[PDB]
Amino acid sequence: MTIEELKTRLHTEQSVCKTETGIDQQKANDVIEGNIDVEDKKVQLYCECILKNFNILDKNNVFKPQGIKAVMELLIDENSVKQLVSDCSTISEENPHLKASKLVQCVSKYKTMKSVDFL
């Protein structure tokens, strides 16, 4: 959008979602750095919140590839985004909250939220 703007939007969404979930600052820092404790209830809620706020996840927890493509296209090369979408779209997680932390874990192997601050 401007990388400076994506960085700001990411900070805003991390702030709003931390308040909405009550996730500890340490656990939120771990998610931001790409160290996702997938089984943690508050990590799941925080991941779900960030994804829904970027419309990557719709209100029914339906995965929207357009949402993740829009974001990722600004950080990584075209073919890597295609690879990301294939990997992330095919995650076998039947639980929606566990799907959300696993989704953020999948995206994070390509680009962590913290890495965007470098940028």
Side-chain angles (χ1 to χ4, degrees), residues 63-92:
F63 176 68
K64 302 284 174 186
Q66 288 120 329
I68 196 62
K69 252 190 274 224
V71 178
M72 291 304 124
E73 205 182 286
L74 304 171
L75 310 159
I76 61 173
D77 67 279
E78 206 186 302
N79 301 337
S80 292
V81 181
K82 297 194 180 299
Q83 188 57 73
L84 176 147
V85 176
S86 172
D87 287 11
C88 276
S89 297
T90 63
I91 293 158
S92 55

Short mmCIF file of all heavy atoms in Angstrom, two decimals, residues 63-92:
data_model
loop_
_atom_site.label_atom_id
_atom_site.label_comp_id
_atom_site.label_asym_id
_atom_site.label_seq_id
_atom_site.Cartn_x
_atom_site.Cartn_y
_atom_site.Cartn_z
N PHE A 63 -11.50 -19.47 4.87
CA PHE A 63 -10.23 -18.95 4.38
C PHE A 63 -10.39 -18.26 3.03
O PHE A 63 -10.96 -18.84 2.10
CB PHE A 63 -9.17 -20.07 4.33
CG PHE A 63 -7.85 -19.64 3.75
CD1 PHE A 63 -7.03 -18.73 4.42
CD2 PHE A 63 -7.41 -20.14 2.53
CE1 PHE A 63 -5.81 -18.33 3.87
CE2 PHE A 63 -6.19 -19.74 1.99
CZ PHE A 63 -5.39 -18.85 2.67
N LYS A 64 -9.92 -17.00 2.94
CA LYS A 64 -10.01 -16.18 1.73
C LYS A 64 -8.61 -15.92 1.14
O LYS A 64 -7.93 -14.98 1.57
CB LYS A 64 -10.79 -14.88 1.98
CG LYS A 64 -12.23 -15.07 2.48
CD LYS A 64 -13.21 -15.49 1.38
CE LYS A 64 -14.57 -15.81 1.94
NZ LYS A 64 -15.49 -16.36 0.91
N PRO A 65 -8.18 -16.74 0.14
CA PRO A 65 -6.85 -16.54 -0.49
C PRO A 65 -6.53 -15.13 -1.00
O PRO A 65 -5.36 -14.74 -0.96
CB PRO A 65 -6.85 -17.56 -1.63
CG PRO A 65 -7.78 -18.63 -1.18
CD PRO A 65 -8.88 -17.90 -0.46
N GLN A 66 -7.55 -14.37 -1.47
CA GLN A 66 -7.40 -13.00 -1.97
C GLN A 66 -6.85 -12.07 -0.88
O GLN A 66 -6.03 -11.20 -1.18
CB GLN A 66 -8.74 -12.44 -2.49
CG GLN A 66 -9.20 -13.06 -3.81
CD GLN A 66 -10.55 -13.75 -3.70
OE1 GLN A 66 -10.93 -14.28 -2.65
NE2 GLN A 66 -11.26 -13.81 -4.82
N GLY A 67 -7.29 -12.29 0.36
CA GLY A 67 -6.85 -11.54 1.53
C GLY A 67 -5.37 -11.71 1.79
O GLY A 67 -4.66 -10.72 1.99
N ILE A 68 -4.89 -12.96 1.78
CA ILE A 68 -3.47 -13.26 2.01
C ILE A 68 -2.57 -12.87 0.82
O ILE A 68 -1.46 -12.40 1.03
CB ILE A 68 -3.22 -14.66 2.65
CG1 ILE A 68 -1.79 -14.81 3.25
CG2 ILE A 68 -3.57 -15.81 1.70
CD1 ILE A 68 -1.42 -13.86 4.42
N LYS A 69 -3.09 -13.00 -0.42
CA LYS A 69 -2.37 -12.60 -1.64
C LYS A 69 -2.10 -11.10 -1.64
O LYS A 69 -0.97 -10.70 -1.87
CB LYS A 69 -3.16 -12.99 -2.89
CG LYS A 69 -2.54 -14.16 -3.64
CD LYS A 69 -3.19 -14.38 -4.99
CE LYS A 69 -4.41 -15.25 -4.89
NZ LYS A 69 -4.43 -16.26 -5.97
N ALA A 70 -3.13 -10.29 -1.32
CA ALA A 70 -3.07 -8.82 -1.25
C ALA A 70 -1.94 -8.35 -0.32
O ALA A 70 -1.16 -7.49 -0.71
CB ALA A 70 -4.40 -8.26 -0.78
N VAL A 71 -1.84 -8.96 0.87
CA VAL A 71 -0.83 -8.67 1.89
C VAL A 71 0.57 -9.14 1.43
O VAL A 71 1.49 -8.33 1.35
CB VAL A 71 -1.20 -9.27 3.28
CG1 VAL A 71 -0.12 -9.01 4.32
CG2 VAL A 71 -2.55 -8.75 3.78
N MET A 72 0.71 -10.46 1.15
CA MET A 72 1.96 -11.13 0.77
C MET A 72 2.66 -10.65 -0.50
O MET A 72 3.89 -10.71 -0.56
CB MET A 72 1.81 -12.66 0.77
CG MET A 72 1.62 -13.23 2.16
SD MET A 72 2.96 -12.79 3.29
CE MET A 72 2.03 -12.06 4.55
N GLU A 73 1.88 -10.20 -1.49
CA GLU A 73 2.34 -9.66 -2.78
C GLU A 73 3.28 -8.46 -2.59
O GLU A 73 4.09 -8.16 -3.46
CB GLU A 73 1.12 -9.21 -3.59
CG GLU A 73 1.28 -9.19 -5.09
CD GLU A 73 0.02 -8.68 -5.78
OE1 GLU A 73 -0.97 -9.44 -5.84
OE2 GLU A 73 0.02 -7.50 -6.21
N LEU A 74 3.15 -7.79 -1.43
CA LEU A 74 3.94 -6.61 -1.07
C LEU A 74 5.27 -6.98 -0.40
O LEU A 74 6.16 -6.14 -0.34
CB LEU A 74 3.12 -5.68 -0.14
CG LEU A 74 1.75 -5.19 -0.64
CD1 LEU A 74 0.99 -4.48 0.47
CD2 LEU A 74 1.90 -4.24 -1.84
N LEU A 75 5.41 -8.23 0.08
CA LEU A 75 6.59 -8.69 0.81
C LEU A 75 7.48 -9.71 0.10
O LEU A 75 8.70 -9.64 0.24
CB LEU A 75 6.17 -9.26 2.18
CG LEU A 75 5.25 -8.40 3.04
CD1 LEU A 75 4.52 -9.24 4.06
CD2 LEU A 75 6.02 -7.27 3.70
N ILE A 76 6.88 -10.69 -0.58
CA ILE A 76 7.64 -11.76 -1.24
C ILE A 76 7.42 -11.76 -2.75
O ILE A 76 6.56 -11.03 -3.24
CB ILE A 76 7.40 -13.15 -0.56
CG1 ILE A 76 5.90 -13.57 -0.61
CG2 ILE A 76 7.93 -13.14 0.89
CD1 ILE A 76 5.56 -15.00 -0.10
N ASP A 77 8.21 -12.57 -3.50
CA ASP A 77 8.08 -12.67 -4.96
C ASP A 77 6.79 -13.39 -5.33
O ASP A 77 6.27 -14.18 -4.54
CB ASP A 77 9.30 -13.36 -5.58
CG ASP A 77 9.44 -14.82 -5.21
OD1 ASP A 77 9.95 -15.10 -4.11
OD2 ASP A 77 9.02 -15.68 -6.01
N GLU A 78 6.28 -13.11 -6.55
CA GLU A 78 5.04 -13.64 -7.13
C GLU A 78 4.86 -15.16 -6.97
O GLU A 78 3.81 -15.60 -6.49
CB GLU A 78 4.97 -13.23 -8.61
CG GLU A 78 3.56 -13.15 -9.17
CD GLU A 78 3.51 -12.88 -10.66
OE1 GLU A 78 4.06 -11.85 -11.11
OE2 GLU A 78 2.90 -13.70 -11.39
N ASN A 79 5.86 -15.96 -7.37
CA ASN A 79 5.82 -17.43 -7.30
C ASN A 79 5.79 -17.97 -5.87
O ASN A 79 5.12 -18.97 -5.62
CB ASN A 79 6.95 -18.06 -8.12
CG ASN A 79 6.93 -17.69 -9.58
OD1 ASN A 79 5.89 -17.32 -10.15
ND2 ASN A 79 8.08 -17.80 -10.23
N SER A 80 6.49 -17.30 -4.94
CA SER A 80 6.50 -17.67 -3.52
C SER A 80 5.12 -17.48 -2.90
O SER A 80 4.72 -18.30 -2.07
CB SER A 80 7.56 -16.89 -2.76
OG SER A 80 8.86 -17.29 -3.17
N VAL A 81 4.38 -16.42 -3.32
CA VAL A 81 3.00 -16.12 -2.87
C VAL A 81 2.08 -17.26 -3.33
O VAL A 81 1.23 -17.70 -2.57
CB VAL A 81 2.47 -14.75 -3.38
CG1 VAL A 81 1.06 -14.47 -2.88
CG2 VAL A 81 3.39 -13.60 -3.00
N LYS A 82 2.28 -17.75 -4.58
CA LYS A 82 1.51 -18.84 -5.17
C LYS A 82 1.71 -20.10 -4.36
O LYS A 82 0.73 -20.79 -4.05
CB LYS A 82 1.90 -19.05 -6.64
CG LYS A 82 1.58 -17.83 -7.49
CD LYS A 82 1.64 -18.08 -8.99
CE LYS A 82 1.31 -16.81 -9.75
NZ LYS A 82 -0.06 -16.30 -9.46
N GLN A 83 2.97 -20.36 -3.95
CA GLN A 83 3.36 -21.49 -3.11
C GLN A 83 2.73 -21.35 -1.72
O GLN A 83 2.21 -22.35 -1.20
CB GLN A 83 4.89 -21.59 -3.01
CG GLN A 83 5.40 -22.85 -2.30
CD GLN A 83 4.91 -24.12 -2.95
OE1 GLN A 83 5.36 -24.51 -4.04
NE2 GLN A 83 3.94 -24.78 -2.32
N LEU A 84 2.76 -20.13 -1.14
CA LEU A 84 2.17 -19.83 0.18
C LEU A 84 0.69 -20.18 0.19
O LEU A 84 0.24 -20.87 1.10
CB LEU A 84 2.39 -18.35 0.57
CG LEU A 84 1.75 -17.87 1.89
CD1 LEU A 84 2.59 -16.82 2.56
CD2 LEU A 84 0.35 -17.29 1.66
N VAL A 85 -0.07 -19.68 -0.82
CA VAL A 85 -1.52 -19.90 -0.95
C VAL A 85 -1.86 -21.39 -1.06
O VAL A 85 -2.78 -21.84 -0.37
CB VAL A 85 -2.17 -19.02 -2.06
CG1 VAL A 85 -3.66 -19.33 -2.23
CG2 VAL A 85 -1.98 -17.54 -1.76
N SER A 86 -1.09 -22.17 -1.85
CA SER A 86 -1.29 -23.62 -1.99
C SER A 86 -1.12 -24.35 -0.64
O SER A 86 -1.99 -25.14 -0.27
CB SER A 86 -0.35 -24.19 -3.05
OG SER A 86 -0.39 -25.61 -3.08
N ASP A 87 -0.02 -24.06 0.09
CA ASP A 87 0.31 -24.61 1.40
C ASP A 87 -0.74 -24.28 2.45
O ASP A 87 -1.19 -25.17 3.17
CB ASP A 87 1.65 -24.02 1.91
CG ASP A 87 2.92 -24.50 1.24
OD1 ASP A 87 2.82 -25.17 0.19
OD2 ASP A 87 4.01 -24.20 1.76
N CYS A 88 -1.10 -22.98 2.54
CA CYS A 88 -2.04 -22.46 3.51
C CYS A 88 -3.50 -22.89 3.26
O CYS A 88 -4.22 -23.19 4.22
CB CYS A 88 -1.91 -20.95 3.65
SG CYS A 88 -0.61 -20.40 4.81
N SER A 89 -3.93 -22.96 1.97
CA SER A 89 -5.29 -23.37 1.57
C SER A 89 -5.59 -24.85 1.83
O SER A 89 -6.76 -25.23 1.95
CB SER A 89 -5.52 -23.12 0.07
OG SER A 89 -5.45 -21.76 -0.29
N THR A 90 -4.54 -25.68 1.86
CA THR A 90 -4.67 -27.14 2.02
C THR A 90 -4.41 -27.69 3.44
O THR A 90 -4.34 -28.91 3.60
CB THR A 90 -3.91 -27.88 0.91
OG1 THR A 90 -2.52 -27.59 1.01
CG2 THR A 90 -4.42 -27.56 -0.49
N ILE A 91 -4.30 -26.81 4.46
CA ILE A 91 -4.09 -27.22 5.86
C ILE A 91 -5.32 -28.02 6.32
O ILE A 91 -6.45 -27.53 6.20
CB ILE A 91 -3.79 -26.01 6.80
CG1 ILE A 91 -2.43 -25.36 6.49
CG2 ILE A 91 -3.87 -26.41 8.30
CD1 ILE A 91 -2.31 -23.92 6.98
N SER A 92 -5.08 -29.24 6.80
CA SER A 92 -6.15 -30.09 7.30
C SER A 92 -6.34 -29.79 8.78
O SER A 92 -5.70 -30.40 9.64
CB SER A 92 -5.88 -31.57 7.03
OG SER A 92 -4.62 -31.97 7.55
#
